[PDB]
Design a protein around this ligand. Structure first.
Ligand code: HEM
Ligand SMILES: O=C(CCc1ccccc1)Cn1cncn1
Length: 214
């Protein structure tokens, strides 16, 4: 559809279904996640968000990203550092895994941010709006399954404290995505990058599932 927000949703409809069907996702939705499995995901998300939010800061002024620049409402790096310190302890940054599928995702993020900053919106869309939509649902599953201590730590990633209403912000973010000035050629590449982003997520959760058994 003419609006980029609708165009991205239509284009990634099929790959989103693939993600829903993914083995780890099937297991998680039924509360079959272990602490090691959950730690593995938190570690992955950290690496992904470090790369993404590094590239966002590099391209925050540029007309190709500036309209969708919402650091205070969306940034997840700081929250993930807080959570990993709980999950992996004081030595978290030394001991956290960095696997091929994490590397490939991080690699693509840096490639986009450095050489194709016009497509960064596709990765920011895929990460932020996805994580915002499922944040509280995924948290509630994690709370039930993982049986945490009363330490008040470990799940900061799943709350966006500067977004009171997810629907309110998502409507604003979509409008800002639609406000982006781009040529027909760039627009098509943005669409393709969104599918690539979804596929990098699918490839990641497939790898994580493979690593968990055993
Ligand atoms: C168990 C797997 C998953 C389920 C059940 C699921 C389900 C959902 C649901 C119910 C929504 C809210 C619908 C809406 O109002 O837009 C949503 C949003 C979204 N999800 Fe997922 N999802 C899954 C995995 C993923 C993955 C791996 C990604 C890739 C990063 C992803 C990306 C997104 C995006 C970008 C949105 C926002 C769509 C929009 O509003 O334009 N999802 N998802
Ligand atoms: O799936 C999402 C983040 C990946 C993840 C999966 C399981 C546990 C923690 C984190 C966000 N999302 C996208 N659509 C709905 N939710």
């Amino acid at each position: 559809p003419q609006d980029l927000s609708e165009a991205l949703k239509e284009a990634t409809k099929e790959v989103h279904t693939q993600a829903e069907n993914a083995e780890f996702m099937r297991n998680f939705q039924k509360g079959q996640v272990t602490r090691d499995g959950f730690k593995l995901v938190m570690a992955s998300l950290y690496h992904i968000y470090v790369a993404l939010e590094e590239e966002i800061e590099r391209n925050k002024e540029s007309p190709v990203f500036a309209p969708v620049y919402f650091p205070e409402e969306l940034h997840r790096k700081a929250a993930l550092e807080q959570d990993l310190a709980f999950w992996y302890g004081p030595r978290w940054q030394e001991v956290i895994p960095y696997t091929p599928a994490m590397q490939r995702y991080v690699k693509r993020l840096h490639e986009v941010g450095r050489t194709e900053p016009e497509l960064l919106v596709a990765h920011a869309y895929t990460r932020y709006l996805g994580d915002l939509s499922g944040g509280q649902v995924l948290k509630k599953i994690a709370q039930k399954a993982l049986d945490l201590p009363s330490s008040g730590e470990g799940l900061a990633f799943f709350t966006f404290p500067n977004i009171a209403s997810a629907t309110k912000f998502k409507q604003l973010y979509r409008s800002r995505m639609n406000s982006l000035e781009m040529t027909p050629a760039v627009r098509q590449r943005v669409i393709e990058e969104a599918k690539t982003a979804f596929l990098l997520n699918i490839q990641l959760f497939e790898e994580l599932q493979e690593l968990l058994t055993h």
